[PDB]
């Protein structure tokens, strides 16, 4: 964990943690409005 969190690049723990929040690439990578892909209340939540 120490090594992963000290890492900062695309392999870093920070990026994978930020998947679930900001910055936002959701729904599409390119959109005028962006949200988080933490599918809550959907039917795909356990899968995600």
């Amino acid at each position: 964990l120490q090594s992963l969190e000290d890492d900062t690049s695309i392999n870093g723990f920070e990026h994978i943690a930020a998947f679930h929040g900001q910055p936002n690439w959701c729904p599409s990578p390119d959109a005028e409005k962006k949200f988080a892909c933490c599918a809550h209340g959907m039917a795909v939540f356990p899968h995600w």
Partner: protein
């Protein structure tokens, strides 16, 4: 094996950050001798 040039690990003098940004020293390019008793505080060389 019939060689042509040095291995890629010892080519770049200042390794790039994989994500991008501040560069970092490449030890595999060269090191530095910093002895004070013999007062040699200079990097080494690769006179290929």
């Amino acid at each position: 094996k019939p060689i042509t040039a040095l291995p890629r690990l010892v080519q770049e003098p200042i390794f790039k950050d994989p994500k991008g940004g501040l560069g970092q020293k490449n030890s595999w390019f060269s090191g530095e001798i910093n002895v004070d008793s013999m007062d040699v505080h200079t990097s080494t060389a690769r006179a290929v």
